[PDB]
Design a protein around this ligand. Structure first.
Ligand SMILES: *C(=O)[C@H](C[C@@H]1CCCNC1=O)NC(=O)[C@H](Cc1ccc(F)cc1)NC(=O)c1cc(C)on1
Length: 181
């Protein structure tokens, strides 16, 4: 219903099929020329968006006040395009949620809704030797190919998927101030 209406709106206008040397990811266009990707996709000076090559002008890998990885990287793309500003759908603080859907859009998983259920606070997560703070979990056997997916519930954007164990899956908590500047 109104929750997925929003997911469609976001798929169409802000969620992009992307590739880096690290493989396939879902990119969230945030506003203007600013997008986010999970840190592990390691975007270089360039990146493929719907297969066309786009320059990356600047790239920040977000960290704690304590310097811990938050597993997110803001990029500023080289285009004449504005993403419709969806920062007003990102809460001020990392928000847990109920019947969330994970929105994925890559070449292999195009236009994809995954019903991950509730999203609960997790916090510290060490995936493959690499710590992350401010993560949240949903109880769903998430997989390779879904990183960068956008976690939504009730018209809010709360998360970018970043990992899983074959049973649960984990996202990077989104908060609006990250998209400040
Ligand atoms: C997204 O690219 C991908 C998605 C995971 C893969 C594992 C199964 N479930 C999926 O949701 N993420 C990763 O593979 C993640 C990469 C990562 C994330 C954060 C970080 F700090 C460093 C690396 N790796 C894992 O989730 C993972 C799973 C096991 C087992 O070890 N590592």
């Amino acid at each position: 219903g109104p929750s997925l209406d929003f997911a469609l709106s976001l798929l169409r206008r802000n969620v992009r099929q992307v590739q880096t040397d690290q493989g396939h990811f879902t990119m969230l266009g945030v506003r203007d020329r600013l997008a986010v990707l999970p840190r592990h996709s390691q975007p270089g000076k360039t990146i493929w968006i719907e297969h066309k090559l786009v320059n990356v002008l600047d790239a920040v890998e977000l960290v704690d006040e304590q310097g811990v990885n938050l597993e997110l990287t803001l990029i500023t793309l080289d285009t004449n395009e504005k993403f419709r500003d969806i920062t007003k759908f990102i809460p001020e603080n990392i928000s847990t949620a109920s019947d969330a859907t994970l929105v994925i859009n890559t070449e292999h998983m195009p236009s994809m809704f995954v019903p991950v259920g509730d999203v609960v606070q997790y916090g510290f997560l060490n995936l493959s030797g690499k710590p992350t703070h401010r993560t949240m979990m949903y109880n769903f056997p998430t997989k390779a190919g879904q990183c960068g997916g956008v976690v939504t519930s009730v018209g809010k954007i709360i998360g970018i998927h970043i990992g899983g164990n074959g049973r649960q899956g984990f996202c990077a908590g989104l908060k609006r101030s990250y998209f400040a500047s």
